[PDB]
Design a binder for this molecule. Structure first.
Ligand SMILES: NC(=O)c1ccc[n+]([C@@H]2O[C@H](COP(=O)([O-])OP(=O)(O)OC[C@H]3O[C@@H](n4cnc5c(N)ncnc54)[C@H](OP(=O)(O)O)[C@@H]3O)[C@@H](O)[C@H]2O)c1
Ligand SMILES: CCCc1n[nH]c2c1[C@@H](c1cc(OC)c(O)c([N+](=O)[O-])c1)C(C#N)=C(N)O2
Length: 318
């Protein structure tokens, strides 16, 4: 079921990823989120970026209205987009997310990325030459606004996404800090298992939440299509055969036994239901060690433009 956060709240260890590319109809987000809840998902991951908060919130309201769940049975996450890092913009961002989702509070509000962008209403602002426009913001002040969001009872918990150890320390060592981040949501899978960052986070009682745990959606706008397909991995498949499960299930179970909270996106009803089966079996100490050895220092996120961002979390590479 759950893990206790450092603010005394609880996060379910399996979460449902709601993002789908824009070629997919937006109503589909409503339909598949109802499916995920119907299947046993209680943690739902969304964001302003995904442009789907209305539909995900409608799914949540739907399953509350028909009596399948209470609001407090549901752990709902949303994220502050990078055009709203400047501190006076943060609460308005959160209030707009709540208005779109028609919810009174999010269970978790995150800084979506440390890579600040030009303030405004374009989510992807570009210049006359079509290059992305960065902004420069002290994320400590952004965090202070996030803390006020918790105090105002608008977010149950607060945390970050896409921070490295350096950027976590920055918040952690902030003068007059009220709340540490409850989690850090980062790309994490057997080819990028983030063991160093994971050990740091545990040291700080900060939950690590894995995204692209299944190797990503391999959107060729943001991922090199010829990168290895995570779920076609020899070891994962051999393990799949050993446990009579699927590579996806092995990849998911892997994170759970490391103490990583794990996300899984699917827009396919059968795969949504297969994924909750992660709780049906266990991997041995020997199996875990074998998956550890798969690490290739490979993040699927690939973008030349964002790599030159000052706060690009992976800038040590290069
Ligand atoms: N920067 C960030 O904070 C960030 C970045 C990325 C993701 N995230 C969040 O966390 C989630 C991370 O997932 P992701 O979008 O990167 O993709 P993912 O969870 O790694 O899944 C990748 C693909 O795996 C397929 N899949 C799912 N279950 C499967 C199964 N049992 N067997 C085989 N294939 C299966 C899905 O395809 P189908 O739809 O066809 O089933 C999906 O497109 C996102 O949805 C989003 O909520 C956050
Ligand atoms: C604008 C669309 C960007 C996009 N389309 N396909 C992608 C992205 C990247 C992404 C960035 C995110 O917040 C910075 C994010 O939250 C999510 N998400 O939730 O799926 C995805 C990404 C990564 N990592 C990978 N592997 O594929």
């Amino acid at each position: 079921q759950c893990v206790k956060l450092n603010d005394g709240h609880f996060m379910p260890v399996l979460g449902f990823g709601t993002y789908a590319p824009p070629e997919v109809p937006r109503s589909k987000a409503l339909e598949v989120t109802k499916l995920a809840i119907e299947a046993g998902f209680r943690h739902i991951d969304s964001a302003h970026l995904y442009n789907n908060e209305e539909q995900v919130g409608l799914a949540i309201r739907s399953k509350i209205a028909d009596g399948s769940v209470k609001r407090e049975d549901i752990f709902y996450t949303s994220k502050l987009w990078s055009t709203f890092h400047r501190p006076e913009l943060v609460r308005p961002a959160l209030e707009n997310s709540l208005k779109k989702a028609q919810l009174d509070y999010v269970d978790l509000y995150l800084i979506h990325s440390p890579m600040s962008l030009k303030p405004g209403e374009e989510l992807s602002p570009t210049d006359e030459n079509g290059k992305v426009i960065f902004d420069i913001v002290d994320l400590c002040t952004t965090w202070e606004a996030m803390e006020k969001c918790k105090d105002a009872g608008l977010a149950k918990s607060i945390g970050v996404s896409n921070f490295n150890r350096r950027q976590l320390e920055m918040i952690l060592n902030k003068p007059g800090l009220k709340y540490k981040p409850v989690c850090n949501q980062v790309e994490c899978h057997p080819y990028f298992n983030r063991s160093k960052l994971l050990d740091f986070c545990k040291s700080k009682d900060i939950v690590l939440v894995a995204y692209s745990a299944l190797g990503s959606q391999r959107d060729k706008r943001w991922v090199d299509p010829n990168s290895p397909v995570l779920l076609e991995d020899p070891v994962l498949c051999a393990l799949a055969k050993k446990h009579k499960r699927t590579p996806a299930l092995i990849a998911l179970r892997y994170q759970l036994q490391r103490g990583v909270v794990v996300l899984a996106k699917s827009y396919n009803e059968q795969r949504i239901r297969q994924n909750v089966q992660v709780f049906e079996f266990q991997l041995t100490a020997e199996d875990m060690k074998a998956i550890d050895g798969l690490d290739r220092n490979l993040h699927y996120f690939n973008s030349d433009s964002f790599a030159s961002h000052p706060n690009y979390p992976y800038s040590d590479e290069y």
